[PDB]
Amino acid sequence: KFNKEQQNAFYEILHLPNLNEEQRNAFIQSLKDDPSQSANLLAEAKSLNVNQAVKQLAEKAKEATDKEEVIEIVKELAELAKQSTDSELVNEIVKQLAEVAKEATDKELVIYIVKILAELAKQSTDSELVNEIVKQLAEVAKEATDKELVIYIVKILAELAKQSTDSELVNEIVKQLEEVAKEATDKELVEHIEKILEELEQQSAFYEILSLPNLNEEQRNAFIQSLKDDPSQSANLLAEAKSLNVNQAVKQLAEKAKEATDKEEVIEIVKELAELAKQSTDSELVNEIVKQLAEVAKEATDKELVIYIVKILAELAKQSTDSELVNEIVKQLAEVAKEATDKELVIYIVKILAELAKQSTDSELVNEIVKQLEEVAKEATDKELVEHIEKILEELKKQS
């Protein structure tokens, strides 16, 4: 025996128009199996009923020869996505509208549907439904054969991007217009899309440069003002900013390492710098990381941390095949050793540079290391240390 809301669920299920009989009887059977789920089944049924509804509508828009019938069907679907509030269904409706457009023989009808989708995106707070509309409009353009349809749709996407604060949507629109231009045989269509892409890319670069966290207010203002004075170089400026942004990030890590009082934290920061340099393929950034590590070692007061950093730089020199970088690490280690006041550290660095020299095939590196150690020995007033360095030097000379 049912109860009011379960019986009402029964009657409603009995009246859903876009279910076939077997789906209705399934939902009724399930309601009789467990009336406590009455709400659930009801909502489930209603969702199914509307989804098949739009499907029915879709095929009626696609079989209709009267250009007004398709306007009424598309308008009905449009009012069903707009005037309703359901997240996943509206996506299905933009996909069906898009198919109706893709198969449309009349350009006016395509323009109407595209306008409707543009208005769904413009009046939407759901980022992923705007992304889906962008995807579908973009596909309509790529498959369109009339030039005017393509121009209209890419101008629509451009206006969607120029009324947006979100950078991911601007970059996604930029990638869809890039694909449309790349698969376009018509040259003036390509040139127009590229002008649009220039404006959009300058906008996006403006937002990115504003969002970069590790530059001060004054170089960010410098970059955006140079962006205003010559927009065409939005790439050249943005690259600059990003490089500078990571550069001053590295220095900040270095400073955060210098000011840490916990050995384990300094170790973690040094691993983050080092293993950022090892996996990064930017030459001057790696250079800056090396000299920042060297400075951390230079002013560090803990023997363990100097040894750790020296070991890190050595490990970077042994696996790197960049000559200027390896000589840069060698000189950095060398002046760490010259300025260090602890014999254990001088001896360790001398052994490290010696290992590098014995590893090296290059005579410029071997003899530069040799002269570095000769300087170190020239400034040492401790006879055990000068003997140590003299042995290392004589073995290095016997090497080659």
Numbering used by the authors: 4 to 403
Excerpt from the publication:
We designed another repeat protein using a protein A-DHR14 fusion protein as the repeating unit. Then, the repeat modules were connected by superimposing 6 amino acids to form the repeat protein. The crystal structure again showed that the two helices had been fused into merged and extended helices with a geometry closely matching that of an ideal helix. We also succeeded in producing novel repeat proteins that have a protein A-designed helical repeat 14 (DHR14) fusion protein as the repeating unit. The overall shapes of the two repeat proteins that we produced resemble the horseshoe-like shapes of natural repeat proteins. Each repeat protein family has a characteristic value for its curvature, which exhibits little variation.
Here, we propose a method for generating proteins and protein complexes with complicated shapes using fusions of alpha helices. To design amino acid sequences that can stabilize the alpha helical structure of the fusion sites, we superimposed one or two turns of terminal alpha helices of connecting proteins using a molecular graphics program. Then, the amino acid residues important for forming a fused helical structure were chosen from the two natural sequences in the superimposed region.
